[PDB]
Design a protein around this ligand. Sequence first.
Ligand SMILES: Cc1ccc(CNC(=O)Nc2cccc(F)c2)cc1NC(=O)c1cnc2ccccn12
Length: 275
Amino acid sequence: GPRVDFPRKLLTFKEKLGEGFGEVHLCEVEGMSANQPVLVAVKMLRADANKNARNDFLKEIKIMSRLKDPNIIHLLAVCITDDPLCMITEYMENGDLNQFLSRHQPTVSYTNLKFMATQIASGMKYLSSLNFVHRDLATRNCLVGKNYTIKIADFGMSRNLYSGDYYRIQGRAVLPIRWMSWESILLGKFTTASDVWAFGVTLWETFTFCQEQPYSQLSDEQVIENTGEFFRDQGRQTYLPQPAICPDSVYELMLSCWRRDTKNRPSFQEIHRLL
Ligand SMILES: Cc1ccc(CNC(=O)Nc2cccc(F)c2)cc1NC(=O)c1cnc2ccccn12
């Protein structure tokens, strides 16, 4: 797994990339590579730190220290000897996919648009195989590297830019209802098939360039109202429309993700093989 206790003084601050638990910094790993040294993302937990919050961070490492895929974020090192506890990952110079695509209609061709979703299906193909369930697959949870390289991460609700993407249902628990299957927002049934339904919405997002929020005309209460219509299956449900620059075949793939029955949905192996 990750390098246990990397020397902290080997990390040179460049800039903080978020403050959601402590804050995330861009750092230069100083000393002995080729031309440019390795730049990393360092997530350091707050000083105050309550036992449960301290435990939450170590639970994040427990989950993150099992992932090893070219399309999954990578946990390089962990500074765990003395406080603050840190978790070190690689750096995706082009930020998140939602922010990246929003700036394009710059231009990314169909081949390269298809290439980003294939890597997402590839990275998702991995998670399934470890019996892991992402629960929140969206372009905001996708990081962009060099030459359209996509890595899947999990940021939670914390990124305040994406607050109107999560619906508070009980206490501090929030839901990405526009990406979730009916059995996910009715029965709380989380499966690879639920992640597949998120993949169809993540592909829709991609093919729309993150310019339109999923279910634009519907509200946070109209979206949960729509889940029941997917279940009732009486032709009173609304699906995402076919994007303008999306082949008939890609929207057909999109549809199979949103099919009512869990078993009737494609696997990530099927999805990756089509893509
Ligand atoms: C440093 C760091 C630590 C913990 C995370 C959060 N992630 C996850 O937990 N993932 C994950 C978990 C389970 C399944 C899965 F599939 C994934 C992330 C980061 N790193 C960044 O935040 C970062 C990296 N490059 C950039 C560029 C711009 C902005 C931020 N970063």
